[PDB]
Design a protein around this ligand. Sequence first.
Ligand SMILES: Nc1ncnc2c1ncn2[C@@H]1O[C@H](COP(=O)(O)OP(=O)(O)O)[C@@H](O)[C@H]1O
Ligand code: BEF
Ligand SMILES: [Mg+2]
Lengths: 168, 56
Amino acid sequence: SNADRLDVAMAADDICTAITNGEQVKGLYLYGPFGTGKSFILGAIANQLKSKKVRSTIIYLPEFIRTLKGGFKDGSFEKKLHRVREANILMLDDIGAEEVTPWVRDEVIGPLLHYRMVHELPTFFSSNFDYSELEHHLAMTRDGEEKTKAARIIERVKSLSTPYFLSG
Amino acid sequence: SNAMMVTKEFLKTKLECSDMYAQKLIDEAQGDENRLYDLFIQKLAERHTRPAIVEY
Ligand SMILES: Nc1ncnc2c1ncn2[C@@H]1O[C@H](COP(=O)(O)OP(=O)(O)O)[C@@H](O)[C@H]1O
Ligand code: BEF
Ligand SMILES: [Mg+2]
């Protein structure tokens, strides 16, 4: 895992340096067991960029989804929510840990990911799941339509990211 | 119908998570109850502490 850590460290270094130099980059999909420092590294990237006057946003997906599911009106969340899809640099922290809610998955997340895919907006992820596992998590049921929707999501995630494993 | 099923539904209920995520927690604990409980509380704390969106 020192090797894992080294690989991810130079990935993050390269990505921050490129972003700061105004280059096109692809985000990281960081995955692995609990507590290996995935969220920490996403935070380190955000703070590194901040140090260079580059903006970025980190969504904590469980609470994002909980807020959307529960409903909201006019506060900080609504104001921030309206910026997320077109944020210059976006990170989805702990995808896989949220409650799966089809309308949120398909009306908010899917379109968001499609947008960032086609406009090549850097998008990062952390998860306890690899892409295959995440695709299965995203399907609320065995139903065909669910399988198709989940597949759409995961292909967009794959187009947007390069996967890195951080070991126990 | 057995302790494992119970533990899984308990995690799904209290963390409000998917079956697969709950099973990931269980697998990670590898049969150690205290380890699973500690992990549960770590994630419970994160869930109730973190804002949905943080802008940098
Ligand atoms: N490189 C690191 N240096 C110093 N503290 C760290 C580092 N990585 C993690 N910590 C801490 O270790 C704990 C677990 O890291 P975290 O990023 O939450 O794990 P996860 O991979 O599950 O997202 C956190 O308290 C986090 O702040
Ligand atoms: F517990 Be972590 F966010 F994988
Ligand atoms: Mg994390």
